[PDB]
């Protein structure tokens, strides 16, 4: 999708195996904000999206936090707590074609801003000078989108296929995770347990704490677990710490 | 529309002015009167734009201006090449396009 | 930037032509196109200009009989004449408008208007008889 | 808790549908006995050219489809009129169905998640409205409108409450802390029971009224066209 | 990528023949060489194949007759034909095997495999008789 | 070995498909199956290769398919420039390569 109707499908509810894309080599920028991609194996987040897209020309590198031009500002921004990866590389053999495929827009002057991770459609006329014009192109009312160029005559200007992967690990159970295959759990034992994600050492005991259906894990007054639903049993255990004290 | 006078005249060396009067809706309220260069046989060339502005790649004796209702095209130091007629274009006063009579420049 | 035309040749009065005009190395949408037309051994006169998109406009002398078009997948810029008379005896040129930034004066900065004319295209003679 | 809750003892508007404006968030209670409310429309123009959320209890199964809808200007749902002409759409969802009966429901938009909360009780008194669903969804939603007789609608507002689990992990009570300088006092001390004294909440501050600007008036605009423009470098 | 041959022409059944595979643009040892031959008005016959390093690899057909070689200094490929035989007759071609991520497929990294052949040499004619 | 048929035809605008029937050990084992097209006087030209892809640059009608231990190339909308053979080369199974009987195809 142009750059002005990025697509974005929200992933959950699969495996993610983020090897596959690691390792790859066609990828020219893979940078990772907030994790690193060497240890997205290992985690598991709520709610995963991919927005795709084309930026040719300049902007090739306006795809991160913190940064302005006409497209992280016009196009797709991304807000400053962005927390994921942006995979780039340029398509030139795929997205070109023997002509010209100007098939990609950019939207050009938009109005005064866009907020983060917001996308509009709109192609309604652009005025810069007097108000009368309404959906009209006149003197000082110009179509607001103008098409992308792209043959290698123009490297800075051929296209780079952009995913921009935004992890969200905080909103919900835990639906989309690693390669991980799991084990058996094991009570009554001091181990270093691993529910989906929520990393951590004790030993699992059962409880009486009444779950309600909807809740998942009991937390402390710090930021630290007391209680778990334990995934492939909805079981409800305790994480007590095994024991310590001076000597 | 825009009259021009139909042909001038010069020796090289010296300068010619070209004038191009209009109403005040183009020339007179807008400020986008350009100015072209056609030589027989060929495409018209742009010489002038913005009213005041020159398109790079072009031989820096060229000059334009207007003076209210009425454009000005200020060739210098004319040489051979410059035989060929020029035409006035103004802006449009909300797109009907208009254009000059043509004049047919002539080096002594 | 290269601009080819074709279409036109000898036609009877109250007929029908459609004139082309492809453009390569930039769009039909990209930069505003407009269509001028030079009378035998005459000035040049505008026929019709086209924006980026959502206009069709022409001149009083044309009105009602010439209407301007293109196809974005090909590329290229079309003029129907409908109704031909014997006063639009000319050859037929399509001019590409000024691309935004133009030369980019560092001043002013993506303010399309930019309103001359950037190369043209070859011409084609259309004769009315 | 910082959330989106019902501010305690607020103006509920008592209906007996016209549309109604969801700014950041909408309470419905109606107390039925023989299901005569038979839903809910949520979007921002519902004229199709945007998507809009629709929610209509079919006999047996919840229906939830964000779809560009045409909807009438009277839509009801008991032959339906509205669920017609739906084009391109991004959303279908199925789920067991909903509904001296009072039935609860809360409606907030939360980054795109529809949040849809719920409690059905046998209205003064208190009761927890645990979570039902949360919809992907991912639209703009300015107004709403029921489908059909007697519903209350309270809005939501950004308001910090002192939620009281209690020892089997159920919401019991509640203290709207900007309701009155009583409750604020209950979150500072984090108690719903405060002893004889004078505790200080907050602090008053004197907001100002009018930014005004003194600059210089002198019109010179900057020679930046004699350092940029220049000739010669 | 470029491959020229040179080595063929007429030989004596029982006799011995060594060909050429000159290769610019790569090495004998970057992507797998491989031999093909094709019968005149024929199919295609593979006839061996060297691997990046390490590998003598040939077909029943001519085991323990031709083996194949190569020059890392002068970046050529050889066959060497010992005991040819008439159903030798064959015009002979050196093809390079696929470069690893070939086409810049993105999902399989670097696994060498990739086993297709890619541009050939121009072939020279072996007529033993 | 692979075989093919020795020949096949068709007329310009519908589809052709080819077939190479083999063991399990390569088509049927391994994922590598390829194909060529070769002109008389010219050198083959890979037409597909991992037995589902197409090398970028060449026609998009090109399509192969592998059912089992047997592969399928299926051209579509034959043009005039089609008219060569075609040689369904599967992987080698240890190195051991093999190539089909090759299908002449002729286009009415
Ligand atoms: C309700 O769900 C869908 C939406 O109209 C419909 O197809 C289905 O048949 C309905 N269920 C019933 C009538 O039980
Ligand atoms: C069809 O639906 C998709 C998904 O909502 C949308 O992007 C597209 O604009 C719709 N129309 C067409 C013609 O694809
Ligand atoms: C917790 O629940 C049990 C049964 O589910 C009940 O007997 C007990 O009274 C509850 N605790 C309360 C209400 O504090
Ligand atoms: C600002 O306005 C006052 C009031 O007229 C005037 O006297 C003064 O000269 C102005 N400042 C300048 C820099 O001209």
Same mark, same amino acid.
């Given at each position: 999708?142009?750059?002005?109707?990025?697509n974005?499908?929200?992933?959950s509810?699969?495996?993610?195996?983020?090897?596959?894309?690691?390792?790859?080599?066609?990828?020219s920028?893979?940078?990772?904000?907030?994790?690193?991609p060497?240890?997205?194996?290992?985690?598991?987040?709520?709610?995963?999206?991919?927005?795709?897209?084309?930026?040719?020309?300049?902007?090739?590198?306006?795809? %991160?936090p913190?940064?302005?031009?006409?497209? %992280? &500002?016009?196009?797709?921004?991304?807000?400053? &707590?962005?927390?994921?990866?942006?995979?780039?590389?340029?398509?030139?053999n795929?997205?070109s074609?023997?002509?010209?495929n100007?098939?990609?827009?950019?939207?050009?002057?938009?109005?005064?801003?866009?907020?983060?991770?917001?996308?509009d459609?709109?192609?309604?006329?652009?005025? %810069?000078?007097?108000?009368?014009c309404?959906?009209?192109?006149?003197?000082n009312?110009?179509?607001?989108?103008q098409?992308?160029?792209?043959?290698?005559?123009?490297?800075?200007?051929?296209?780079?296929?952009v995913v921009?992967l935004?992890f969200?690990?905080?909103?919900?159970?835990?639906?989309?995770?690693?390669?991980?295959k799991?084990?058996?759990?094991?009570?009554?034992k001091?181990?270093?347990?691993?529910?989906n994600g929520?990393?951590?050492?004790?030993?699992?005991t059962?409880?009486?704490?009444?779950?309600?259906?909807?809740?998942?894990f009991?937390? &402390?007054?710090?930021?630290?677990?007391?209680?778990?639903?334990?995934?492939?049993?909805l079981?409800?255990? &305790?994480?007590?710490?095994?024991?310590?004290?001076?000597? | 529309?825009?009259?021009?006078?139909?042909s001038?005249?010069?020796?090289?060396?010296?300068?010619?002015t070209?004038?191009c009067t209009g109403?005040? $809706?183009?020339?007179?309220?807008?400020?986008?009167?350009?100015?072209?260069?056609?030589?027989?046989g060929?495409?018209?060339?742009?010489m002038?734009?913005?009213?005041?502005?020159?398109?790079?790649?072009? $031989?820096?004796?060229?000059?334009?201006?207007?003076?209210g209702?009425?454009?000005?095209?200020?060739?210098?130091?004319?040489?051979?090449?410059?035989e060929?007629?020029?035409?006035?274009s103004s802006?449009?006063?909300?797109?009907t396009?208009?254009?000059?009579?043509?004049?047919?420049?002539?080096?002594? | 930037?290269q601009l080819?035309?074709?279409?036109?040749?000898l036609?009877?009065?109250?007929?029908?032509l459609?004139?082309?005009?492809?453009?390569?190395?930039?769009?039909?949408?990209?930069?505003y196109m407009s269509?001028?037309?030079?009378?035998?051994?005459?000035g040049?006169?505008?026929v019709?200009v086209?924006?980026?998109?959502?206009s069709?406009?022409?001149?009083?002398?044309?009105?009602?009989r010439?209407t301007?078009?293109?196809?974005?997948?090909?590329?290229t810029? @079309?003029?129907?004449?409908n109704?031909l008379?014997?006063?639009?005896?000319?050859?037929?040129?399509?001019?590409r408008?000024?691309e935004?930034?133009?030369?980019?004066?560092?001043?002013?900065?993506y303010?399309?208007?930019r @309103?001359?004319?950037?190369?043209?295209?070859?011409?084609?003679?259309?004769?009315?008889? | 808790?910082?959330?989106?809750?019902?501010?305690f003892?607020?103006?509920?508007?008592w209906f007996?549908?016209?549309?109604?404006?969801?700014?950041?968030?909408?309470?419905?209670?109606?107390?039925?006995?023989?299901?005569? =409310?038979? *839903?809910?429309?949520?979007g921002?123009?519902?004229?199709?050219?945007?998507?809009?959320?629709?929610?209509?209890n079919?006999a047996?199964?919840?229906?939830?489809k964000?779809?560009?809808?045409q909807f009438?200007?009277?839509p009801?749902?008991?032959?339906?009129?509205?669920?017609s002409s739906?084009?391109?759409?991004?959303?279908?969802?199925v789920?067991?169905?909903?509904? #001296?009966?009072?039935?609860?429901?809360?409606?907030?938009?939360?980054?795109?998640?529809?949040?849809?909360?719920?409690?059905?009780?046998?209205?003064? *008194?208190?009761?927890?409205?645990e979570?039902?669903?949360?919809l992907?969804?991912?639209?703009? =939603?300015?107004?709403?409108?029921?489908?059909?007789?007697?519903?209350?609608? *309270?809005?939501?507002?950004?308001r910090?409450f002192?939620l009281?689990?209690?020892?089997?992990?159920?919401?019991?009570?509640?203290?709207?802390?900007?309701?009155?300088?009583?409750?604020?006092?209950?979150?500072?001390? #984090?108690?719903?029971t405060?002893?004889?004294?004078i505790?200080?909440?907050?602090?008053?501050?004197?907001?100002?009224?009018?930014?005004?600007?003194?600059?210089?008036?002198?019109?010179?605009?900057?020679?930046? *066209?004699?350092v940029?423009?220049?000739?010669?470098?």
């Amino acid at each position: 999708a142009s750059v002005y109707a990025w697509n974005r499908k929200r992933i959950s509810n699969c495996v993610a195996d983020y090897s596959v894309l690691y390792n790859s080599a066609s990828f020219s920028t893979f940078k990772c904000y907030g994790v690193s991609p060497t240890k997205l194996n290992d985690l598991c987040f709520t709610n995963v999206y991919a927005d795709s897209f084309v930026i040719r020309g300049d902007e090739v590198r306006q795809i %991160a936090p913190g940064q302005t031009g006409k497209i %992280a &500002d016009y196009n797709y921004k991304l807000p400053d &707590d962005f927390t994921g990866c942006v995979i780039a590389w340029n398509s030139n053999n795929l997205d070109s074609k023997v002509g010209g495929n100007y098939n990609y827009l950019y939207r050009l002057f938009r109005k005064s801003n866009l907020k983060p991770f917001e996308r509009d459609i709109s192609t309604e006329i652009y005025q %810069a000078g007097s108000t009368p014009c309404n959906g009209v192109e006149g003197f000082n009312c110009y179509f607001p989108l103008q098409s992308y160029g792209f043959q290698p005559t123009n490297v800075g200007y051929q296209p780079y296929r952009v995913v921009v992967l935004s992890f969200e690990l905080l909103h919900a159970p835990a639906t989309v995770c690693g390669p991980k295959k799991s084990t058996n759990l094991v009570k009554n034992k001091c181990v270093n347990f691993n529910f989906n994600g929520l990393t951590g050492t004790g030993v699992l005991t059962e409880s009486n704490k009444k779950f309600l259906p909807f809740q998942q894990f009991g937390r &402390d007054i710090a930021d630290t677990t007391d209680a778990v639903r334990d995934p492939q049993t909805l079981e409800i255990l &305790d994480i007590t710490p095994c024991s310590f004290g001076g000597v | 529309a825009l009259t021009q006078p139909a042909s001038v005249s010069g020796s090289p060396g010296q300068s010619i002015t070209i004038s191009c009067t209009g109403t005040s $809706s183009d020339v007179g309220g807008y400020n986008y009167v350009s100015w072209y260069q056609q030589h027989p046989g060929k495409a018209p060339k742009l010489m002038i734009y913005d009213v005041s502005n020159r398109p790079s790649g072009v $031989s820096n004796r060229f000059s334009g201006s207007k003076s209210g209702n009425t454009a000005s095209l200020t060739i210098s130091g004319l040489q051979a090449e410059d035989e060929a007629d020029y035409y006035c274009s103004s802006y449009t006063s909300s797109s009907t396009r208009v254009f000059g009579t043509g004049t047919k420049v002539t080096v002594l | 930037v290269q601009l080819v035309e074709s279409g036109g040749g000898l036609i009877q009065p109250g007929g029908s032509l459609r004139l082309s005009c492809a453009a390569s190395g930039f769009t039909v949408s990209n930069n505003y196109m407009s269509w001028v037309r030079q009378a035998p051994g005459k000035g040049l006169e505008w026929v019709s200009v086209i924006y980026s998109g959502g206009s069709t406009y022409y001149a009083d002398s044309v009105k009602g009989r010439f209407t301007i078009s293109r196809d974005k997948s090909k590329n290229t810029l @079309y003029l129907q004449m409908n109704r031909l008379r014997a006063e639009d005896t000319a050859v037929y040129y399509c001019a590409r408008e000024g691309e935004v930034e133009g030369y980019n004066d560092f001043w002013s900065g993506y303010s399309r208007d930019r @309103y001359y004319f950037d190369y043209w295209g070859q011409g084609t003679l259309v004769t009315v008889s | 808790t910082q959330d989106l809750f019902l501010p305690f003892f607020s103006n509920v508007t008592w209906f007996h549908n016209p549309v109604l404006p969801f700014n950041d968030g909408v309470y419905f209670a109606s107390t039925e006995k023989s299901n005569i =409310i038979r *839903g809910w429309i949520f979007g921002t123009t519902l004229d199709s050219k945007t998507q809009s959320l629709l929610i209509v209890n079919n006999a047996t199964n919840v229906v939830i489809k964000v779809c560009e809808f045409q909807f009438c200007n009277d839509p009801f749902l008991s032959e339906f009129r509205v669920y017609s002409s739906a084009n391109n759409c991004t959303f279908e969802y199925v789920s067991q169905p909903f509904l #001296k009966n009072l039935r609860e429901f809360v409606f907030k938009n939360i980054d795109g998640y529809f949040k849809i909360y719920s409690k059905h009780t046998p209205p003064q *008194g208190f009761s927890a409205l645990e979570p039902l669903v949360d919809l992907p969804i991912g639209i703009n =939603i300015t107004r709403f409108q029921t489908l059909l007789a007697a519903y209350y609608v *309270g809005y939501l507002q950004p308001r910090t409450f002192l939620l009281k689990y209690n020892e089997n992990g159920t919401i019991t009570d509640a203290v709207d802390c900007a309701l009155d300088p009583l409750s604020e006092t209950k979150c500072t001390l #984090k108690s719903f029971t405060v002893e004889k004294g004078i505790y200080q909440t907050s602090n008053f501050r004197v907001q100002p009224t009018e930014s005004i600007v003194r600059f210089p008036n002198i019109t010179n605009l900057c020679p930046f *066209g004699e350092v940029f423009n220049a000739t010669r470098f």
